[PDB]
């Protein structure tokens, strides 16, 4: 904002893009969403072999197999050789250790 002037909406929006660029984390899991451009490549192919009533579930197993092997991206570039321990994995390490010290 200048002294006599008026602030423009293309500069109010450039500022808002800097606020949402802080909402992305500095190191994130690339959990891949299956796009509908490749999701209908599956279910129409699974309608070709006549199994179209289970064509919905062949797509989710394609999505999950890409999801359980998700890679971690820091700045767009993947950090390979990075291991993380989930809060569902570490909550079973607590639960089996709570159950064997309770026994």
């Amino acid at each position: 904002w200048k002294k006599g002037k008026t602030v423009s909406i293309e500069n109010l929006n450039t500022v808002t893009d800097k606020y949402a660029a802080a909402l992305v984390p500095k190191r994130k899991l690339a959990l891949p969403v299956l796009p509908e451009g490749v999701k209908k490549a599956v279910e129409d192919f699974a309608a070709s072999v006549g199994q179209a009533k289970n064509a919905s579930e062949v797509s989710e197993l394609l999505a999950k197999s890409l999801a359980e092997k998700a890679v971690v991206t820091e700045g767009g570039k993947v950090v390979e050789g990075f291991s993380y321990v989930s809060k569902a994995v570490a909550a079973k390490v607590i639960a089996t250790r709570r159950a064997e010290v309770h026994e």
Binding site: N13, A20, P25, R27, K28, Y84, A90
Partner: peptide, 30 residues
């Protein structure tokens, strides 16, 4: 301006790769 901010905050909050995991951001902490 508020109409751009509700679809820019949702453009990062509908993306599931932008979910913050403490196990991924801070490995030594978790």
């Amino acid at each position: 301006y508020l109409a751009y901010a509700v679809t820019k905050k949702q453009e990062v909050q509908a993306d599931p790769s932008n979910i913050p995991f403490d196990e991924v951001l801070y490995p030594q902490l978790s």
